[PDB]
Amino acid sequence: AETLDPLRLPLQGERLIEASAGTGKTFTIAALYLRLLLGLGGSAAFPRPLTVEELLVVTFTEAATAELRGRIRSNIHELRIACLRETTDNPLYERLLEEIDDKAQAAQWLLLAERQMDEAAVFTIHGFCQRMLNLNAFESGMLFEQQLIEDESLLRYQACADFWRRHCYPLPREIAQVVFETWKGPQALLRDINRYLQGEAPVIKAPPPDDETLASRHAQIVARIDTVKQQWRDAVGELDALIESSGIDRRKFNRSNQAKWIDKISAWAEEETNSYQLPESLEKFSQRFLEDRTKAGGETPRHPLFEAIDQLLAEPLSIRDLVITRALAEIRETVAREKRRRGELGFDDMLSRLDSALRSESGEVLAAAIRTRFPVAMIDEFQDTDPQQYRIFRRIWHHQPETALLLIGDPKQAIYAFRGADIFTYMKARSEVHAHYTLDTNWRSAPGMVNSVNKLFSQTDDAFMFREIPFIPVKSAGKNQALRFVFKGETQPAMKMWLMEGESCGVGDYQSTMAQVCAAQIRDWLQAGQRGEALLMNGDDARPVRASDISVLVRSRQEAAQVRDALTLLEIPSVYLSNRDSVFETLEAQEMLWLLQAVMTPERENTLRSALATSMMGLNALDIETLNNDEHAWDVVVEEFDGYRQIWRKRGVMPMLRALMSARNIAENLLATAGGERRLTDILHISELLQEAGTQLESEHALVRWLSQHILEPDSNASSQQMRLESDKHLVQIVTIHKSKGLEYPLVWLPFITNFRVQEQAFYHDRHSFEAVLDLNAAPESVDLAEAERLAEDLRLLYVALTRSVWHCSLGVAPLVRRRGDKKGDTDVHQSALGRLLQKGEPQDAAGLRTCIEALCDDDIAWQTAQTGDNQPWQVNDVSTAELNAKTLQRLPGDNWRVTSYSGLQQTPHQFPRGASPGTFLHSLFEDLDFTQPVDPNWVREKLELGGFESQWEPVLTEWITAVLQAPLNETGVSLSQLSARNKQVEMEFYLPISEPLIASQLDTLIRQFDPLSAGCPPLEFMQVRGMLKGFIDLVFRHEGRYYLLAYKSNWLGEDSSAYTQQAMAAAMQAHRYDLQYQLYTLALHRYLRHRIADYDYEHHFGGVIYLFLRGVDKEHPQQGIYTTRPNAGLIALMDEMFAG
DNA sequence: TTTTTTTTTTTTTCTAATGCGAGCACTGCTAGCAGTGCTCGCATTAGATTT
Ligand SMILES: Nc1ncnc2c1ncn2[C@@H]1O[C@H](COP(=O)(O)OP(=O)(O)NP(=O)(O)O)[C@@H](O)[C@H]1O
């Protein structure tokens, strides 16, 4: 191992950089990034300078990714500024500038990089896999559009239930008994193998044969038990004489007990072998049991039956391993198949699919696709690495030239074993890499904390109990030498262990006492910092200890809740950063549901009363009592809820809840009440979720259905449903040890560091092959091999949790006993991670623990006994509130301007079906119809196929169309067939501006003056409108240099042709107010012609208006169906002037 | 193709480990009996993580 200098580090091949915590592993990423962008280092430099898009960086968490991206951006900016100024105030940038040959070109490259920083290739492992799969779906063999699912619990449980149905159902009742004894159902079966299903499959030690079915194992075990029973049956009488004759202590083996045991074993042997249960007395008659208890130098009773019983009881009889193996294969297969069917994908599935692709035949090509894309890749937090990830990284970047690979990690921090990560693969990689580099100095914390840690981990030799993980002392940097933490004028020791009092302490008592002590100490720190006494000082500078800089690191959820409850008992604000609880699980969700349910149907008194009596409203009991008696108050409430329903129907969801909160003053009363701030935040969050979900759901009742559904089954994994932060003020941050990786905290607490657990399951790694091995049998060898790794993981977790703090870290210590009996004897602290380092891995009593603590204590490490904290709430000095006033609006905004059409302002062929779609189809027919050619039957048949009407109309409709085309027109006698494509314009769209507001009264008067149809009808009624007017003219055509306007109408006036006469057509025009319609159309056409036609005249060039009633068109009567009307020129001129100004 | 009624609640783990109490065989002390060492059985209590 060599000391590391970022400028001199060569970037070629594989390089491993390992160092202790807070030594600047992450900080070196930025320096290496800058070196890569500029291509600095000469011999140690990359052969060619690279771009932002060609550097890969892989981090463990998303937050770390964002942090690193931002910091790289900042560093690029600062280095560019330095290159432009040729001077800088930082030593790293100064050395870089000394190394740079040309500074102008360097600044140019840095500028390009800064501009491309949006495309920085900084991902996590799962994001990198997903992105490489999507960018190379062709080589990998995936689909081009893949979906992402975060939670596979439902698919997994469904596959397990399918396995159960297929296998456990057909079984006979006798094998079914044995299966039912082990697992009650698929729910319990999934619980055992849930961990093994996730990630790579575990090698099973001593797997059953492939052809062995359940019935074969059952028959084998039944045969063994039958043999033992028969051997007992044959020797049921000789054993008494054998035991009596031979010499064995009868104090250990009483004659009455012997007779009882013989009777029980005989009764069991005569019993039919229905189940695998064996009596306990067989343990007494084992050869080893007899050999253990016998006279010194005396005859020992020995019989072949005893040897048979000893061989039988040596290993448990069960079908567990076979069923577990079959399920572990079949459920995984089924899940993969279903996910392939739906075209979905998951994180573990992403990694496994990329690995499979690289391992397949085409993967070689895929390898180049990833290798050419990312020449250099830097993996951070490499200690947490799965075998899949290392296989991928090796396959891609092992031996190819012109491609570097930088592995940065600390094995002492490998704490994600539970998540599939492995330390043994890290050590494999460490063996496979030749070069090693190290960081010497700690830049994170005060020199006190560094010395404390160095002293605590130097107690024993090979503290981390792995030969490949040697511990060495680290040295603090010169910048932090001044750091101190002063409490009440006295400098506190860097690390303080709070020892609990007593000999034997239970787990629950330990948790309660330490939670209380931590709460009391945090309260004292806050009280002393509020008066400016307690200060975190860097030399002369200082600052008080806010409730934010204090962090409490916990291992489990229940632990964090135990901390938070006691911490809130002292009225101290705190928040738990690892909280995955869902909002809908709170009571506010239920209250909001009751409120919506009452608003929906205020008629029902029960639902309304239930919604009123919620804590959210804040009514008392006397309020509800008086309100259940007075009818007027109840009626007023019903009325306001009915109005809320109207608001809810019209404006949506959030407006209704907002009006309710305003009228009932819910927000003010909640903020006034103690604790109501969290309540109001949850209410607002639920309101936002309800609005988001009500946008998509069109029905109002569907939203209540959706809310009840979500309340019934809250999804904790959902990100949107995560509970928001209570307040933006200072909060004590409770964070788990795993989530605290790579972070930093001024003051740190570890209330329950001593607490541990013993691993019962047998899952370990072979010391030779370094492969994950699951032993479905409970052989104690496997259990010991697993417990050793558990202890190593606990030691690494302890190291991680200790290296977080900067100024001060406290931690609880107690003589924790995990065994009920022999509490007076040795404690179980030695098994705990911290205890093993305090007692040098030697079991001791409480006095021994206290003496070891006292011996360990020095200037940096001080111990104090833990006592019950004083129950006094933290007092916070309130602050006066200044005068507050909201602004008001002097000028109201105007909605006068708008764009409207005629519809907004207004607001056998005879037996043919009618409607909106039939009318649109009839119009679309003429839209693309050629008038100069006869109708084609195939075209009409195709249009009837499109519309879906009966083909029976096809012979008739064609004829009807010709009746339209050949029908004559106004006295000029124009036939629609006579119109060439040059003299026609179909569906012309027009825009007509209306500058002054259009008043219905000021127009209706003129229209009545110049048109009798308006005089017959009542006055026009519509609101003032200023803006534009849109419209679509059906047809415009010119004949004999005279223009016309044609409008199609398919309204079914009547059943007979008499309803299509002149008077009836005029009546229909007056009824549907087509008068104003054609008047506006004429104004539009007049303006368009005046614009386009040079030397235009209304009387000369205009020809009138023609309404064509399709169904009215009949060959028998020329007048029926067509209507012709010419607006007065004076009306047109006055209307134009009105609309113009 | 016509129509009437009615309002309330119920459940909750399991395994394991020990402490004591009762019974008994052995055995040493002054043939029986008290101590002792032991052992089985019933009741009581503790604990069950982490992206
Ligand atoms: N060369 C340096 N000069 C100045 N400060 C540094 C230097 N290297 C690291 N630091 C500071 O040291 C602190 C922690 O460094 P960091 O890069 O997080 O190391 P680390 O290996 O990531 N710690 P961890 O993530 O827990 O393993 C930060 O405040 C950095 O600014």
Ligand SMILES: [Mg+2]
């Ligand atoms: Mg880091």
